[PDB]
Structures are given as C-alpha cells and as structure tokens.
Amino acid sequence: MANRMILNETAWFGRGAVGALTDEVKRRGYQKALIVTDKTLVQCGVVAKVTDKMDAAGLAWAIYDGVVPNPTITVVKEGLGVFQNSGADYLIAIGGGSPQDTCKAIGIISNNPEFADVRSLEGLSPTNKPSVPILAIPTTAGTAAEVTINYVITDEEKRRKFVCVDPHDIPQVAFIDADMMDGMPPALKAATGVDALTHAIEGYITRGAWALTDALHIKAIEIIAGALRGSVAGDKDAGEEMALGQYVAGMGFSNVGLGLVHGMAHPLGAFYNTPHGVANAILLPHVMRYNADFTGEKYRDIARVMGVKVEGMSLEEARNAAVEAVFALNRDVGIPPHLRDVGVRKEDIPALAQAALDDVCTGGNPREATLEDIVELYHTAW
Amino acid sequence: MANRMILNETAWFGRGAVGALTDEVKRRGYQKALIVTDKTLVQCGVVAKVTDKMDAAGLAWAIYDGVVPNPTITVVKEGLGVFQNSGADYLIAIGGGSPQDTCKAIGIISNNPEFADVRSLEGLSPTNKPSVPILAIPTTAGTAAEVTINYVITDEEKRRKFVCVDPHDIPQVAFIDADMMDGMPPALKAATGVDALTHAIEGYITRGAWALTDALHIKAIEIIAGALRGSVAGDKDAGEEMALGQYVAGMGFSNVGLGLVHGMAHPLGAFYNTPHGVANAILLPHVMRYNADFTGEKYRDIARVMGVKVEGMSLEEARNAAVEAVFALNRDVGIPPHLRDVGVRKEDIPALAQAALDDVCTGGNPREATLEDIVELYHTAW
Ligand SMILES: NC(=O)c1ccc[n+]([C@@H]2O[C@H](COP(=O)([O-])OP(=O)(O)OC[C@H]3O[C@@H](n4cnc5c(N)ncnc54)[C@H](O)[C@@H]3O)[C@@H](O)[C@H]2O)c1
Ligand SMILES: NC(=O)c1ccc[n+]([C@@H]2O[C@H](COP(=O)([O-])OP(=O)(O)OC[C@H]3O[C@@H](n4cnc5c(N)ncnc54)[C@H](O)[C@@H]3O)[C@@H](O)[C@H]2O)c1
Ligand SMILES: [Cl-]
Ligand SMILES: [Fe+2]
Ligand SMILES: [Fe+2]
C-alpha cells in the first residue's frame, strides 16, 4: 500500500520566527485568536512575547491559561467553553505538549461537536470536519505537537492517557523559535530533549517505517544527540539545534507511528504524574534491548550518529553501543536511571502493563509484546 | 532572520498512491475536477489510470490536455479559459513540470484575476488569494512541481522562460507514484532525473541553504545518485526510489533557492527548446567548478553520497571528485557532453548570458556572477 505524509503547510524556523505570526494572521484575514497556554508560561512573560507583537500589529486576542500538565478532559472542555464564547476566529497555542494537545482537542470539537465527550476521539478520530485553524508555537524541545497529527489527553475518571490521531489536527502554521524555549529549566530541557530522542528512535524502527521516515528520523537523532547536552548546559545555539531536531523527529513518527517506549510511558503518566519525557527516558534503552533483534541495520546508524565509532563492530556490537549511548545520554543529562526513583510501585506493574498493552502506540513496536513481556520490561526498568 | 518552509499539507507516496485520490476529493467534498495534462499523457493511457478511478468512485471531471513543454502564456491563457467554462471546482494536475506549472498558473489567475496577463506574476508574486485547490500528480522523476512554490512560463513574445514564486500556488495534496512515471522512455527518465540532481545540488549550495534544507538536499542526492542509472536502465524499484528523490529535492529547493545552472538553462529552453533537464545536465558540472570554491565542505559530502571514496582527500581533491561524479552520471545516463550537440549557437551566447544573469534563480548562486562570467560559462560548456 501507499504511504501518506502530513506536514505543516507553513512553518517558520529559528530565533525570532515568532515575528512572522502577525503577518501569517494578516495574510489569512483571521479576526480574533484564543491563545491556549499555562499560567506558568504567561507569568514568565513567554506568552507576552507573542501577545505584545499582536498588540503592535493591531490583532485581537484572548487567553485561556487553564491547561495543566497532562491535560485532562475537564481542561479540554473548559477551553472549548472559553473558545466558544471568545468570538475567536482561530487559535494560537503557545506551549509544549499540554497546551498544544489541548488546543487541538479544543479545535477539533469546535467543528466536530459530535465529539463533545472527548473519549471518542481516541484512535483514528472519525472526524468529518477540519479543526479551527491553529497556529502552533512550541516552547519545549520535545513534543513536536506543532507538527503531529496526534494529541494525548488524560481521562482522570479512567486514569488512562489516551491518544488521538487525526490529520484534521494539523496546524496551518508552526512557529518554532528557540527564543520561546530558552525559559526551560535544565531538567525540563533534558526531559523534552529525550522525549524527542525517544520520538526519533521509536519512529526509526516503528512498523510503518519507510524511506522518507527513515531519513528524517535519523537526521533528528543526529541533531538531538549532538546538542541536547550543551542545551541542557545552556549554550544558546544548541537550544536552536534542539528546537529543530525535535521538529524533524515529528515529521516522521507522526506519519508513521511509534512503539512500546511510549506505550509504557503513558500509563506511567496517568498513574503517577511522571513527566512524559522522563518516563520515555527511563524505558527507552530497556525497550531498545527488547527490540534489538527486530531492527535490521537500524541501531548501527543510531550508534553512529550518536558519536560511537561503529566501524568494524558486529551488528551485535553496534546494537549494544546504541543502547549504551542512550543510557549514557540520560545519565549525562541527569535523568534518573530507574523507575523506583520516580516512585513507581511494583504492585502497579500488572496494571501499567495492561494499560501499556492496550495504549495505541504499542502497535507500532517492531516486535509484538504480550502482557508478560511488558511486566518484565517494567520490572527490569524499576 | 528566520527561515520559512512550505510543504504539501498532504502527500501520498508509493506505487498506487493515485488510489488515494478519489478518497481525498470525497473527504473534502469538491465537486468537479479540471484535469490539466498533455495529449501524450492522455494517449498513453496514463490519464485513464486516474479518470477510471474517478469514474468508478462517482466523481465528475473535465479535462484540458492542450499543454506543450515549456508552456506558453497562450497555453496558460487558453487553459484558464477552459476551466472558467466547466464548473470546475478544483484541479487535478497530471504530468511533468509542464502541465503542473500550467495548472498552478491557472489556479492562481482564476483567483487573482488581477494578473490575467502572466508576466505580472514573475518573481515573488504579489498575489492576494490562495490558488484554486490543486491535487498534483507527477508523471516524471524530476520537476517536483507538486511540492514547490514556483512555476515557469515561456513568454513567446519576449522569448524567455520566467519563474513565478508564490506560496499561494502550493497544491493541497501531492500524489507520488512511480506507476505514473513508468512510461517515461530512458532519455526522459534521464533528463528529468538529472534535473532532480541539479535541484538537489543547487539547493544544497544555494545562498539561503540552512540545516533543514541541507538535510533534505543531501538525502535527495544520495537517493537520485543511487538510482538514476537503474531507473533509466529499466529497474522499477529504481523508478520508485527516484519518484521519491525528486520530491525530496522539491522539499528542499522550493524553500531556499537554486542558482546558475537553472539560470543558464532557462534561457536555453526559451531559445532552442533544449529540454529543461538536458540543459541543466550539460551545464551542471561546469557551474559546479565555477562554484567549487564557494561551497564550504559541501562537495566533499556530495562526492561521498555519489559513491566517491572521499576518505583521504583534501577539500581540493574532493571538490574535484564531485564535479567528476556528475560528468560520470551524465555520460552513464546518455546526455550529450556539449551544448554544441544540442544546437546552441556561439553568436547567441551574449544574449543568453544576459538572460541568465536576469533569471530569478541566478541570484541564488553561492558565487556571485557577472555577465562575462556567464559568457565564459556558456563558452566552456559549448
Ligand atoms: N502521543 C504522542 O505522540 C506523545 C509524544 C510526546 C509528547 N506527548 C504529550 O506531551 C505532553 C508533555 O508536554 P511537554 O513535555 O512539552 O510539557 P508540558 O506542556 O506538559 O509541561 C511542562 C511544564 O513546564 C512548563 N514549561 C513549558 N515550557 C516552558 C518553557 N519554555 N520555559 C519555562 N517553563 C516551561 C509548563 O508550565 C509545564 O508546567 C504530555 O501530555 C504527553 O503525553 C505525547
Ligand atoms: N522552477 C523550477 O524549480 C524548475 C525545475 C524543474 C522544471 N521546471 C520546468 O518545468 C518543466 C519540466 O517538465 P518535465 O521536465 O517534467 O517534462 P514536461 O511535462 O514539460 O514534458 C516532457 C515531455 O515528456 C512527456 N512525458 C511526461 N511524462 C511521461 C510519461 N510518464 N510517459 C511518457 N511520456 C511522458 C510529455 O508528454 C512531454 O512530451 C519544464 O518546462 C521546465 O521549464 C522548472
Ligand atoms: Cl474583542
Ligand atoms: Fe513523546
Ligand atoms: Fe529544474
């Protein structure tokens, strides 16, 4: 069968790319924006970075800063509520994954009112209408929500992170500038950083993978690998490299699926508020051993682009080094090695597994996994 | 300053990608297509491959097949006329750069009645309104018109091919299937493929080059350089690999520039009907030399992914090996080595050099060029 690629129709890149917004807005004759963000972001005057411009350029905006980390259905519903009484024409998402995943959730239901429950919207959400135009403005080096046809909501009632996939999500225009992401404390840089490295590795070896996907993913790894460290350290250029590499990572996995790292991280999100990027970080390499045999030459390139001298190693040698370059990046960026450090309880392993076994992402893993494969992975990552 | 990237919001890739067409149209309720093609494409049962699926799916379509290579203003005028007179809702473009570029011309003017003339539309087209939605379907392993933000028209009057650049022109979906491209005779696969390697190389070194665009272009060269031989020699898997290559190149250079090769090829088309890719082909290595010294480490990369063992080389050895790699491909693919061979006239060189100097692409060249520099160039390529 054929392979479909969904990208942003327009995207702006690099420091000050947010400058382009007011004109994008103009060129499309939008009238009012609903900004969708955190209170944290509004307080550090990150949001101001955009709103101020909108002020000079004469552009109407209102705010919903109600998004909490791991955005819940109630959060989504509130935004929709705000949006629908705003007079807003479109929406601007300033934020990482939470506000951005909210905003898409918000945009879809505003045109697919049929789905007001927000659970039906999991899977390949069967939407007849394209979302309210959205301008995506990421402020983390991670999620790549600005480019992905997916968004994840938390359903408190059912303590489960559920994933929505729908080409209708796709922002009209993405503004990716490292200026908006400089605010990120070091822990948050490392976390988002690794979320993307995860994105890129899972995408490289997912089941839908193919030529275009493979190229982008490996690029993004190459970028992330050689930059997350100095970005975590503060060097500004590396922030810009990170900003890019997570964006490249999204061009792939979005259009091609992920795998079980993400499948095991979600339930972990929903169960213990474990920061999504941190979950992945811990699992990633353990899932990489679990996957090593089913990935052809792949890990060899993964080892390469992460600085390892793969030349004349056995495929087994290369497969280790890549898993090892990963363990090594997490430690060097201050991610805690074990699940116990982030307070996972073994009594929960059988649940976590079932939730992982069910999570939409898991299907992409190159190697099918039963309950008891996952029970093990969690145990050995604990 | 910031970089902008303009891409297809949807694209399908893979043998049979046209199959997803009837679907897109339906998912977004258009009503009547104006198919824009060649009489040849019609006659070689190739258009049928799409009209048959649309008939079977219940979709209405009309067709304008009046297009010629290096499409004239009149061709664009006449086509539009037909569209204005068919109740056509959106447009499907089937064919190489010629019907695709004619198709964009039509889609733009039919929304920007302002430039009903087609000269007033050269350069950064001051168009106020997005083109009529165009679904693009290439039948050549070249042009990349399905993803680029530009089209080229022949002014038979002032005889010069001129280039129009406008994000409004971007097709909504692009459909990339080698199945469409199989009919190309070896000379055609050869010509259009090296147009593709020309874009990949020009866009790799063009003035606006940067991280993301370098990545695509370098991937493109890798792919093209690896498959052209086989495509031309008949390999269908080579055909598919190509189909992708040229698209990828499109993703790069649309968003960044080309340079002297296109700038000296456009005035050659206009004067002598020299096919776009053969003009490019002949011209490419010479312009490469002229450019060598102003292209950083780029040639070293170019040479590697064209199979040259750049291992122990100096940037000098390496730059030379790149220009060399191309002379090899041209030979191997059956393109004439000299402009003399394709009817170019020493008398005309001044006029051509002037034309080249004026071409929008030229200014993208890493090495600034003068009239006399272009003269030298045409002369040394003759
Ligand atoms: N299905 C998928 O493809 C998948 C993949 C990746 C991420 N996700 C989703 O992404 C979400 C996580 O998003 P996230 O990690 O970007 O962060 P976030 O939006 O959830 O929150 C991070 C915290 O950091 C603060 N913050 C954010 N940006 C900042 C900055 N620039 N400077 C200072 N402080 C900042 C915020 O206020 C917030 O409290 C989760 O809901 C996750 O499930 C899903
Ligand atoms: N601005 C730019 O970036 C740039 C780059 C590439 C091309 N161009 C322009 O676009 C056009 C290039 O078009 P092209 O090179 O694809 O060729 P084309 O569409 O102009 O036509 C070439 C000939 O090949 C035939 N043909 C095409 N596909 C076929 C198939 N599958 N089977 C059998 N015959 C087939 C056509 O019928 C036609 O006779 C040129 O006119 C050129 O001026 C501009
Ligand atoms: Cl108001
Ligand atoms: Fe993630
Ligand atoms: Fe070309």
UniProtKB/Swiss-Prot annotation, chains A, B:
It is an enzyme of class 1 (oxidoreductase). One of its GO terms (biological process) is fucose catabolic process. InterPro entries: ADH_Fe/GldA (IPR001670), ADH_Fe_C (IPR056798), ADH_Fe_CS (IPR018211), Alcohol_dehydrogenase_Fe (IPR039697), Lactal_redase (IPR013460). The keyword tRNA processing does not apply. It comes from the Bacteria. NAD(+) binds at residues 38, 70, 97-98, 139-143, 150, 161, 180-184. Pathway: Carbohydrate degradation; L-fucose degradation. Its EC number is 1.1.1.77. GO terms for molecular function: alcohol dehydrogenase (NAD+) activity; metal ion binding; R-lactaldehyde reductase activity; S-lactaldehyde reductase activity. Fe cation binds at D195, H199, H262, H276. Keywords: Carbohydrate metabolism, Fucose metabolism, Iron, Metal-binding, NAD, Oxidoreductase. Belongs to the iron-containing alcohol dehydrogenase family. NCBIfam families: lactal_redase, PRK10624.1. Homodimer. This is Lactaldehyde reductase. It comes from Escherichia coli O157:H7.
